[PDB]
A paper describes a structure:
activation loop conformational energetics in [name]. function of [name], as has been postulated for other kinases. crossed in the transition between DFG-in and DFG-out states. kinase suggests a high free-energy barrier for the DFG flip.
which has almost identical affinity to ponatinib. inhibitors is not affected by the conformation of the DFG motif30.
Numbering used by the authors: 464 to 581, 592 to 647, 651 to 765
The structure:
Amino acid sequence: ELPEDPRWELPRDRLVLGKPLGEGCFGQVVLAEAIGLDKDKPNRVTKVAVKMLKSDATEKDLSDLISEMEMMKMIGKHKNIINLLGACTQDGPLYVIVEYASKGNLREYLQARRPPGLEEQLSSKDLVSCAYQVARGMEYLASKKCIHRDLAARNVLVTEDNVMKIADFGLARDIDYYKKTTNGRLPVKWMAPEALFDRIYTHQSDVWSFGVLLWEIFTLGGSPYPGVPVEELFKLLKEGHRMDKPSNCTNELYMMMRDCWHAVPSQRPTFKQLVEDLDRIVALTSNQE
Ligand SMILES: CN1CCN(c2ccc3[nH]c(-c4c(N)c5c(F)cccc5[nH]c4=O)nc3c2)CC1
């Protein structure tokens, strides 16, 4: 049984469910319509995302979704993170109501806006702006002592207004290195060597992951290290190997990626330094190409 928090509780008759946005088997996300979410108007509908459990859910799977909601309540609001909007915790299945990003993840979005081969296209100032927002989201998360542990283009969602929002920042701590994603990608490729070989996740290991994220932006949703299996990736990290400079990527932004991949975690930039640099770079980057 669950206790009511009146700050966040939404009556169940105010949530009209819809088409599913994602799956697991670890839970499921659906598209929904929340009636009068805001204090005024109680007659306006907001399109939302509803996190819920599957039929084959256990007490562990349930405590995991509670902790996530609980984490989001503590962390607070930012324009560049997926915010918490409400919850249905009484007399039925637990529904954690979060922000809905109509354009999907940042990898899918970037891939769908690639140049023709072989209706909407992003300029140089556009790509750098995506990097700025994600570093803004991550810096707030860092200010609130949150360590993402899986910062990647896949876990950055995009709104109808082209705002970048960090997602799955509140997920349960609980990893199989040989496991691949839905898109058949190995998540170990976003991991800092200290986190991968010593299990030491810090704000510095998330900075490493931001470096893999930039490479994903300026390659327009490119796959890091294609064809490279798990065991061959460890050898690449031990030799001091680094990814190649994307084409249509400045010397300044590649120097940034490489700094993010500094072998020594203490020597890497902070998100507070990355927000500042990208703030300046956007202002100097051309919107004409
Ligand atoms: C063919 N395909 C159909 C579904 N397409 C799609 C489009 C937008 C989408 N937004 C989210 C979504 C979440 N999955 C989500 C989450 F998992 C945790 C927290 C917040 C979230 N907010 C969302 O808005 N899913 C989407 C799927 C992609 C293309």
